[PDB]
Amino acid sequence: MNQQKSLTLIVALTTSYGIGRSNSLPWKLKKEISYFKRVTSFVPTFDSFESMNVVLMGRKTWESIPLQFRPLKGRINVVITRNESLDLGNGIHSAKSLDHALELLYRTYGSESSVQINRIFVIGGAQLYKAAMDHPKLDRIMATIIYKDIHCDVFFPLKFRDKEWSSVWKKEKHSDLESWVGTKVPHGKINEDGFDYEFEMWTRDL
Numbered sequence: 001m002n003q004q005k006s007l008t009l010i011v012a013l014t015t016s017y018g019i020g021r022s023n024s025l026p027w028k029l030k031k032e033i034s035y036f037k038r039v040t041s042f043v044p045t046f047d048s049f050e051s052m053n054v055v056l057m058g059r060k061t062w063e064s065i066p067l068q069f070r071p072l073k074g075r076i077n078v079v080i081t082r083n084e085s086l087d088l089g090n091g092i093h094s095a096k097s098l099d100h101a102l103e104l105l106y107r108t109y110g111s112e113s114s115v116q117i118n119r120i121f122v123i124g125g126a127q128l129y130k131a132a133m134d135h136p137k138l139d140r141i142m143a144t145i146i147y148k149d150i151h152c153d154v155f156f157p158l159k160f161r162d163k164e165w166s167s168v169w170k171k172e173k174h175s176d177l178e179s180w181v182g183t184k185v186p187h188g189k190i191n192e193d194g195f196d197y198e199f200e201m202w203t204r205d206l
């Protein structure tokens, strides 16, 4: 009654797999955030009357989001934590592992529910990404590649863009990224703050 939907991981990372520094992002990129909001929120119009997407995140990520921007609007939010007592407020969901989140969601939003789930995203941090990369239902990575070896202290756990992983993970064409994301997405290099970045989509076979 569960293992039926695929998981999609969304991440912005340097060419050295850096994702974080001092409990925050190593960059300030407003349009990169707008893309993250766009992808994580998008539900096809017909299904958008009743269906929403879900963002799964680690408790340090949840705490890293300035309060002004939490919970992430227009998406079902779930925080992964072993702190049974952490009070999320506003009902925000809490779960003790990736699979306990999945069971909670399916229980909460089943055929007996006004709200239905469309897509499920894993949105960080490194610890939850490590669990997600080990999960048998993770098949897609929406990666924002940042072309600067910006100093980081937290790293993405599996080098999916490298030669060692290239029989399993493959980068899809931009049109395929767009057909998946449901809208036209900026193609090629964007420079918001002194370095280039670009949007990619990587998939593997389940």
Ligand SMILES: NC(=O)C1=CN([C@@H]2O[C@H](COP(=O)(O)OP(=O)(O)OC[C@H]3O[C@@H](n4cnc5c(N)ncnc54)[C@H](OP(=O)(O)O)[C@@H]3O)[C@@H](O)[C@H]2O)C=CC1
Pocket: 010, 011, 012, 013, 018, 019, 020, 021, 022, 023, 024, 025, 057, 058, 059, 060, 061, 062, 064, 080, 081, 082, 083, 096, 097, 098, 123, 124, 125, 126, 127, 128, 129, 131, 154
């Ligand atoms: N560049 C990007 O795209 C992103 C970067 N980041 C960066 O990641 C860094 C934070 O990453 P990290 O320190 O790894 O933190 P996480 O956000 O992964 O949160 C870790 C905490 O989440 C809970 N948790 C995570 N995974 C599991 C699990 N598999 N099972 C049970 N509990 C789990 C635990 O909570 P508890 O301790 O309460 O039990 C753990 O202490 C920051 O620098 C942040 O800015 C974050 C998201 C995106």
Ligand SMILES: CN(c1cnc2nc(N)nc(N)c2c1)c1cccc2ccccc12
Pocket: 010, 011, 012, 025, 032, 033, 036, 061, 064, 065, 066, 069, 122, 123, 124, 143, 144
């Ligand atoms: C968890 N997070 C974040 C930011 N950008 C991301 N970019 C990509 N491509 N992928 C992610 N998982 C992101 C997460 C955030 C970290 C800090 C502030 C945020 C404000 C609004 C939305 C997300 C915020």
